[PDB]
Swiss-Prot record, chains A, B:
It comes from Homo sapiens. Residues 76-97 are annotated as: Required for interaction with DIABLO. This is E3 ubiquitin-protein ligase XIAP. It is found in: Cytoplasm; Nucleus. S-Nitrosylation down-regulates its E3 ubiquitin-protein ligase activity. The chain holds residues 254 to 354 of 497 of the full protein. BIR repeats lie at residues 12-77. Belongs to the IAP family. Zn(2+) binds at C47, C50, H67, C74. Monomer, and homodimer. Part of a complex composed of SEPTIN4 isoform ARTS, XIAP and BCL2, within the complex interacts with SEPTIN4 isoform ARTS and BCL2, SEPTIN4 isoform ARTS acts as a scaffold protein and stabilizes the complex. Interacts (via BIR3 domain) with DIABLO/SMAC; the interaction inhibits apoptotic suppressor activity. Interacts with HTRA2/PRSS25; the interaction inhibits apoptotic suppressor activity. Interacts with TAB1/MAP3K7IP1 and AIFM1. Interaction with DIABLO/SMAC hinders binding of TAB1/MAP3K7IP1 and AIFM1. Interacts with TCF25 and COMMD1. It is linked to Lymphoproliferative syndrome, X-linked, 2: A rare immunodeficiency characterized by extreme susceptibility to infection with Epstein-Barr virus (EBV). Symptoms include severe or fatal mononucleosis, acquired hypogammaglobulinemia, pancytopenia and malignant lymphoma. Multi-functional protein which regulates not only caspases and apoptosis, but also modulates inflammatory signaling and immunity, copper homeostasis, mitogenic kinase signaling, cell proliferation, as well as cell invasion and metastasis. Acts as a direct caspase inhibitor. Directly bind to the active site pocket of CASP3 and CASP7 and obstructs substrate entry. Inactivates CASP9 by keeping it in a monomeric, inactive state. Residues 9-24 are annotated as: Required for interaction with SEPTIN4 isoform ARTS. The first BIR domain is involved in interaction with TAB1/MAP3K7IP1 and is important for dimerization. The second BIR domain is sufficient to inhibit CASP3 and CASP7, while the third BIR is involved in CASP9 inhibition. The interactions with DIABLO/SMAC and HTRA2/PRSS25 are mediated by the second and third BIR domains.
Amino acid sequence: TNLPRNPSMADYEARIFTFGTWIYSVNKEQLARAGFYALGEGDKVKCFHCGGGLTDWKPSEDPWEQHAKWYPGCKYLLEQKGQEYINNIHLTHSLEECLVR
Amino acid sequence: TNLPRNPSMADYEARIFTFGTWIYSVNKEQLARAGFYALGEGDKVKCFHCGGGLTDWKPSEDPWEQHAKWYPGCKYLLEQKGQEYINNIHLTHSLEECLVR
Ligand SMILES: CC[C@H](N)C(=O)N[C@@H]1C(=O)N2[C@@H](CC[C@@H]1CCN)CC[C@H]2C(=O)NC(c1ccccc1)c1ccccc1
Ligand SMILES: CC[C@H](N)C(=O)N[C@@H]1C(=O)N2[C@@H](CC[C@@H]1CCN)CC[C@H]2C(=O)NC(c1ccccc1)c1ccccc1
Ligand SMILES: [Zn+2]
Ligand SMILES: [Zn+2]
């Protein structure tokens, strides 16, 4: 019942093709696999399914982790990585905040 | 490397038979799927691969959760349930403890 917000980008290849001019350290193959396609604008990327937008990618950041961190509600993410993966990213954040602050 | 501790109980078939005569509040189907077999001695069970023993099963405890809770380093558990599930169980524990006073 949760239709993708961008059906034309539902294909992996459809997404990698948006990374023609891709000059950034974060891997194009990983970004597409994680559901993201580039917007031809900064390093801005969007998830074809949930429509989540991400920018300012740091050297060693995982597209999957960042997808779950910011947009845990994504159906595509859930089907690819499962509940555990998602809940883990969020359990970690809470534990860490709880241990420090 | 990590050779199974009781090689004879590797087959699901071998484990289920160990129950049959089973009078306890925990589902024997799941225990066997989780890698456990009964000892015909209380409600004591043991995992075929890691040798981890469990006892005193409450009404609604999950064989897999309990396995991960007490014996996180079991190879069979890792191959069956994966990294995320295991860490998941332990993160929750950490987060809980760390949250309660
Ligand atoms: C992806 C890893 C990166 N280091 C990061 O965490 N980026 C965050 C981010 O992309 N967003 C969060 C803000 C904190 C970060 C940005 C500041 N370094 C909130 C959602 C996202 C974001 O800023 N998205 C953009 C956007 C819009 C459209 C397409 C792609 C990205 C945004 C801009 C303006 C308003 C709302 C969202
Ligand atoms: C499995 C769920 C249950 N509620 C539970 O948590 N049981 C624990 C348990 O089985 N073990 C932990 C102790 C707390 C529990 C027991 C009393 N609530 C530690 C390991 C295990 C346990 O008691 N194992 C037994 C044992 C021995 C041989 C076969 C099976 C179980 C044990 C008894 C005495 C010494 C060492 C281990
Ligand atoms: Zn998404
Ligand atoms: Zn085990």
